[PDB]
Amino acid sequence: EYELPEDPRWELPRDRLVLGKPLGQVVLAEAIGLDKDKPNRVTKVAVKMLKSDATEKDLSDLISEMEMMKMIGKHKNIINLLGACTQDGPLYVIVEYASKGNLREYLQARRPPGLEYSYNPSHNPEEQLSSKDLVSCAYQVARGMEYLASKKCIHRDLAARNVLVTEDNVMKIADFGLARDIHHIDYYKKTTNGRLPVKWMAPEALFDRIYTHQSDVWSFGVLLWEIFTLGGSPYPGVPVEELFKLLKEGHRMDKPSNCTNELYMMMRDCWHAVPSQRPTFKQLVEDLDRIVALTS
Ligand SMILES: [Cl-]
Ligand SMILES: [Cl-]
Ligand SMILES: [Cl-]
């Protein structure tokens, strides 16, 4: 056995957790008595756990994320820590559940049947989003990142795929507390859900692997492009191999078909080549708030 830290304010007895279906390892579950003021209320939650092939370092990473969430604290627009099971078995890290999945697939399923968006790959199409909904969506993500930035949390992989949507359509940033790998992990390597993380990385992160709040702001720019393409894929037809060269030479994605000039300028600002010139999430929140108000 190892020494998993018990933490009385967060510890939950395993019998109070009823395992549902898998999420992604992460699974859906029901928790009885989360608020131990209300011991008779079931809460639907997501449960982070190790894979069957997990290693000591993997265990250490999960604990790191858990402890990190404690220190970062709560915000409306992040996936919050709710509890943990460290005793009688496999480590379970309990977090907030977002029933409507990640933002990218959420947007794609809501594309109009037109053609100035790409095709709607969902067999279960939903109503589409108003112009104010989309800007309000960007606002929420910015607010979450503004909070994280204030807690000196650097995400290193902000993308629509890492933003979750609740039953009440609240945007929540996911996997912000993940640990940085001490080995030179290949970013050209495609992730399990087929995404190429490299396309969201700032130039300085690609070149010297320097990650900062400003590099997170770069990623938010790419995320902004994802939103107003309703889940579009970045740099269409550009080989990853040549992405850095092109960015250095000042290549930037073109304005999405349905996007205001103000919002595209915001993207561009986020994509400034000099990190110090990019806006801050604080500035981004302010500006987006004004824009939300004027979109209606
Ligand atoms: Cl992913
Ligand atoms: Cl992709
Ligand atoms: Cl697309």
- Rounded Cα distance, 23 and 155, in Å: 21
Residue labelled with tokens 């010139």: 277
23 is in an annotated binding site: yes
254 is in an annotated binding site: no
- Rounded Cα distance, 133 and 281, in Å: 19
Which residue numbers in the chain precede an interruption (C–N > 2.5 Å)?
24
Strand partners, 78: 173
Report every protein residue that has its C-beta within 5 angstroms of ion ligand 2.
Answer: 195, 233
Distance (Å) from CA 105 to ligand 3 centroid:
11
**Active-site position among 15, 133, 157, 269:** 157
Ligand at minimal distance from the CA of 230 is 3
Resolution (A): 2.3
* Domains located in the chain, CATH noted: 4-97 (3.30.200.20), 98-293 (1.10.510.10)
- Rounded Cα distance, 164 and 177, in Å: 15
- Rounded Cα distance, 122 and 99, in Å: 16
- Whether 157 is catalytic is yes
Ligand at minimal distance from the CA of 253 is 3
Report every protein residue that has its C-beta within 5 angstroms of ion ligand 3.
Answer: 118, 232-233
Distance (Å) from CA 219 to ligand 2 centroid:
13
Distance (Å) from CA 162 to ligand 1 centroid:
7
Q: Which structure tokens are listed for 130?
A: 């108003």
User: What experiment produced this structure?
Assistant: X-ray
Three-state SS letters, the chain: CCCCCCCCCCECCHHHEEEEEECCCEEEEEEECCCCCCCCCEEEEEEEECCCCCCHHHHHHHHHHHHHHHHHCCCCCECCEEEEECCCCCCEEEEECCCCCEHHHHHHCCCCCCCCCCCCCCCCCCCCCCHHHHHHHHHHHHHHHHHHHHCCCCCCCCCHHHEEECCCCCEEECCCCCCCCCCCCCCCCCCCCCCCHHHHCCHHHHHCCCCCHHHHHHHHHHHHHHHCCCCCCCCCCCCHHHHHHHHHCCCCCCCCCCCCHHHHHHHHHHCCCCHHHCCCHHHHHHHHHHHHHHHC
